Design a binder for this molecule. Structure first.
Ligand SMILES: Nc1ncnc2c1ncn2[C@@H]1O[C@H](COP(=O)(O)OP(=O)(O)NP(=O)(O)O)[C@@H](O)[C@H]1O
Ligand SMILES: [Mg+2]
Length: 333
């Protein structure tokens, strides 16, 4: 549960294949471990542990089941792959299980935190790979809903893979305020629009693009209303017709009483950035999702012209019932 040796003994009781080396990721409901597969010629592999707290709530367990299903559903180079599903043979012992994925060197949150220099060529390849991945996910009728730098895995080859389908949605729910990271939520989410689209993932890419171009997270809200303030302070006060197009009645009312903020100068925010980069960034971060750039349009944008090259529908359907479904996904290996 905690020490590496304790985790190793736990994994060995599931499958003797995997040798643990070091913990590379920490989550709210489990840790991520760098392991080597002794039967696959000691190749490096990532292992994602799911702890007991997931199987205490039905909602949480249904989320993890969908995540495994989605990982197995996709077979693409820009989406993190699924290698195995380790589950306890005894239902009386099933209070945890492991998700085995391909290994990536690091992720973007990290990369940005190191303050490492990134060229426009680096950003172009990152952004296109992320968009191309989103196009595949969206074509399968799935919305990622959690597009953040931490959920974007990268190598020194600048190869990119999207991970964490833990909050993925069908292409209308009540968003929670009890969150640790709300800085990448689209304005339609922030303003409590019950029904949203795949454009919320585009917003996340824009936020990521804003940071890749040389910046800390653009919209650092401490709460929901404050998140809206941080967004509007930057992109500027939207037109009356756009305000009426997104948000609940109360959210629209608050936004109208707010003082006028002009569209901030992207050129001043990024003195070195190309006009193509600043336009894609501007269009990705449009208030109204209906006027916001789409994934297809973003892939065809002049900023990615040297990279652009001219999927099946995912079917959505107690805690014990979820556990049984997870082992069924394990049998497939
Ligand atoms: N295949 C992988 N290779 C390398 N690092 C990884 C890999 N998968 C995950 N990580 C790291 O582990 C972190 C957390 O993994 P993640 O899949 O995002 O679970 P999570 O953040 O807890 N969301 P949840 O689905 O609710 O568990 C990521 O931010 C990465 O830094
Ligand atoms: Mg994550």
């Amino acid at each position: 549960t905690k020490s590496l040796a304790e985790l190793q003994a736990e994994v060995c009781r599931l499958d003797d294949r995997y040798l643990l080396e070091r913990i590379i990721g920490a989550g709210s409901y489990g840790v991520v471990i760098r392991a080597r597969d002794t039967k696959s010629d000691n190749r490096l592999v990532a292992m994602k542990r799911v702890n007991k707290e997931i199987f205490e709530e039905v909602i949480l367990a249904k989320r993890i089941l969908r995540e495994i299903k989605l990982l197995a559903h996709f077979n693409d180079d820009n989406i993190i792959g699924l290698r195995n599903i380790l589950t306890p043979e005894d239902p009386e012992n099933f209070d945890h299980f492991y998700i085995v994925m391909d290994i990536m060197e690091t992720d973007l949150k990290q990369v940005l935190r190191s303050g490492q220099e990134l060229t426009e060529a680096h950003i172009q390849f990152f952004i296109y790979q992320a968009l191309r991945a989103l196009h595949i996910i969206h074509s399968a009728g799935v919305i990622h809903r959690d597009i953040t730098p931490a959920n974007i895995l990268v190598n020194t080859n600048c190869d990119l893979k999207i991970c964490d389908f833990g909050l993925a949605k069908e292409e209308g729910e009540y968003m929670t305020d009890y969150v640790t990271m709300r800085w990448y939520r689209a304005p339609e989410l922030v303003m409590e629009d019950k029904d949203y689209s795949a454009q919320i993932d585009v917003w996340g890419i824009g936020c990521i693009l804003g940071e890749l171009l040389g910046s800390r997270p653009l919209f650092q809200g401490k709460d929901r209303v404050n998140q809206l303030d941080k967004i509007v302070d930057v992109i500027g006060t939207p037109s009356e017709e756009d305000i009426n197009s997104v948000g609940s009645s109360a959210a629209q009312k608050y936004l109208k009483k707010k003082s006028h903020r002009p569209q901030a100068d992207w050129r001043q925010r990024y003195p070195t950035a190309s006009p193509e980069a600043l336009d894609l960034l501007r269009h990705m971060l449009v208030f109204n999702p209906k006027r916001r750039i789409t994934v297809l349009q973003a892939m065809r944008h002049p900023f990615l012209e040297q990279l652009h090259d001219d999927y099946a529908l995912f079917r959505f359907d107690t805690i014990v019932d979820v556990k049984r479904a997870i082992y069924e996904e394990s049998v497939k290996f």
